[PDB]
Ligand binder design. Structure first.
Ligand SMILES: Cc1cc2nc3c(=O)[nH]c(=O)nc-3n(C[C@H](O)[C@H](O)[C@H](O)COP(=O)(O)O)c2cc1C
Ligand SMILES: Cc1cc2nc3c(=O)[nH]c(=O)nc-3n(C[C@H](O)[C@H](O)[C@H](O)COP(=O)(O)O)c2cc1C
Lengths: 106, 104
């Protein structure tokens, strides 16, 4: 449903692709998010310990699944169940990350 | 989850990205599928009427959701619950399609 792809070879690992679901979940337009790092979803209640775990997973290029507070464009809080996965080229060099977002609201 | 991205501007609308989930569902490696049209998943039991529906949605650049028989690399049949969505660039020109696949 909700997924993004980023390009870690570009500065600050920007989003280069986002699904319609992600746009609807976050209330941003495709135009507003392309070329930005996904961290703009974080806000006042976001646990920095979880952010650090993500940062570490990215550095190590390992898949990870975490739960963290994110915010829509209007500032609406939601729990984001976030899955991250690296993808590498045939020479083995990191090429993309993808992320799948689930809203944990009931 | 299981998803792929294709580029309809390239000859024959090849897969340019596939999730790990898609690879597990279909039993193919990323190397084996990149640069190929997804039709290699089809086979004898695949309903051609549904294939035509997909073709028309792509030609019309419209989202669609269909159900069709596919085959894994080893030849195992599965129903593919397939949702297709066009994506446009900032100028409004068709740029990609994405597809989300569910095994039932
Ligand atoms: C593919 C991908 C998707 C991501 N999706 C989210 C997300 O939905 N919400 C979020 O808070 N961070 C997301 N991130 C994490 C941030 O981009 C960034 O990695 C995180 O904030 C840790 O880095 P930092 O300490 O430099 O901010 C995603 C990262 C990647 C690579
Ligand atoms: C993004 C995307 C994903 C697709 N995924 C599948 C798939 O998983 N299985 C399948 O049988 N066809 C899939 N297709 C459809 C085929 O690639 C092709 O469009 C269809 O077979 C009709 O074209 P044809 O008559 O030339 O074969 C997908 C198409 C797109 C654009």
């Amino acid at each position: 449903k909700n997924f993004v792809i980023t390009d870690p070879r570009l500065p600050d690992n920007p989003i280069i692709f986002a699904s319609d679901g992600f746009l609807e979940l976050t209330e941003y337009s495709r135009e507003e998010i392309l070329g930005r790092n996904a961290r703009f979803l974080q806000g006042p209640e976001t646990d920095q310990a979880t952010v650090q775990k993500i940062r570490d997973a990215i550095r190590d290029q390992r898949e990870t699944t975490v739960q963290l507070i994110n915010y829509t464009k209007s500032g609406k809080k939601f729990w984001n169940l976030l899955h991250l996965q690296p993808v590498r080229d045939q020479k083995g060099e990191l090429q993309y990350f993808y992320g799948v977002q689930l809203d944990g609201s009931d």
